[PDB]
Write a protein that binds this ligand. Structure first.
Ligand SMILES: [Cs+]
Ligand SMILES: [Cs+]
Length: 327
DNA sequence: CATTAGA
DNA sequence: TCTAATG
């Protein structure tokens, strides 16, 4: 957590680079298990050789630990950190729509900067266009003050259209968070579950609603169960307009909400931990259900969930307010 | 780890 | 179809 710091940090810096700037899935994958294992290790690595006794720790990596341990740096790291091409990719990658694959290409073409991208809006697809458009806004954090604002409108129309709907804004927002990166609405309806062969409309309906009023302003992607877009709070009586905000809505069979909701609510750890516990408690938790474990090794048979509660009661725990689902 | 765009 | 990108 801190004794092994520099190492894991450098190591991850190393991994991340193979993956993006190069296409070295493997070397990349390498650096990471290593960085993984060196991280669990309970003592201060004092030398390569020492680390070297680790799994995943080979000669290549080890050699690296030395240099780092020896001098407070690493050339390869100082070399890459410098490298304009590699920088470029690092950068282009921020644009929403742009991944590594695209970034390399863009680069290869000569598009390295923000403006470069403008000059060639043509080479970009819709997503990347939008992302390009809202580069600033996209990067900006969402104040809870605002999330509340948004959550308000969202449950409003949801209700308007159909009153049989159920929305929940999941995420760190759900969990108290002073701010968030984007909004996440989990959606369901009774008329939709496991078998009941869809009703795409159910998603459609709402999307349209939220648009009709000017809340949604772009569409990054719209499927039959997972809308992914951009939104904006009605810029008031002027002098202050609201930044463009990423929003995502998703349809879910009423019969898998709560686990879904639980799950997306986090945190990553609260989850893992609650999850780990259900195991002992003779259960299995995953984003969609909760199955009782059978001794043979495994088992199935989803247990009926009507609320966050059921899942809890199940593994016989303390209902944890989302506020304190921190871990 | 599954859904959506796209070409 | 496969392959990229989000989450
Ligand atoms: Cs080893
Ligand atoms: Cs990106």
């Amino acid at each position: 957590e801190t004794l092994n710091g520099g190492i894991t940090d450098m190591l991850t810096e190393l991994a991340n680079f193979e993956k993006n700037v190069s296409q070295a899935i493997h070397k990349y994958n390498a650096y990471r298990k290593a960085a993984s294992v060196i991280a669990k290790y309970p003592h201060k690595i004092k030398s390569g050789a020492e680390a070297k006794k680790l799994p995943g720790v080979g000669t290549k990596i080890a050699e690296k630990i030395d240099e780092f341990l020896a001098t407070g740096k690493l050339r390869k790291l100082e070399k890459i950190r410098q490298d304009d091409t590699s920088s470029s990719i690092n950068f282009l990658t921020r644009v929403s729509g742009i991944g590594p694959s695209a970034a390399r290409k863009f680069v290869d073409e000569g598009i390295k900067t923000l403006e470069d991208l403008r000059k060639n809006e043509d080479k970009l697809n819709h997503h990347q266009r939008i992302g390009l458009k809202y580069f600033g806004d996209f990067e900006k954090r969402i104040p809870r003050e605002e999330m509340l604002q948004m959550q308000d409108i969202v449950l409003n129309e949801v209700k308007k259209v159909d009153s049989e709907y159920i929305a929940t804004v999941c995420g760190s927002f759900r969990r108290g968070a002073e701010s968030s990166g984007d909004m996440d609405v989990l959606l369901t309806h009774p008329s939709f579950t496991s078998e009941s062969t869809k009703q795409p409309k159910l998603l459609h309906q709402v999307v349209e609603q939220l648009q009709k009023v000017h809340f949604i302003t772009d569409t990054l992607s719209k499927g039959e169960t997972k809308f992914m877009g951009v939104c904006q709070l009605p810029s008031k009586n002027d002098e202050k307009e609201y930044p463009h905000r990423r929003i995502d809505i998703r349809l879910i069979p009423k019969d898998q909400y709560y686990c879904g909701v639980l799950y997306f609510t986090g945190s990553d750890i609260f989850n893992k931990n609650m999850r780990a516990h259900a195991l002992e408690k003779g259960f299995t938790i995953n984003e969609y259900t909760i199955r009782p474990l059978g001794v043979t090794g495994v088992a199935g048979e989803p247990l009926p969930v009507d609320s966050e509660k059921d899942i809890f009661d199940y593994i016989q725990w303390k209902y944890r307010e989302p506020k304190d689902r921190s871990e």
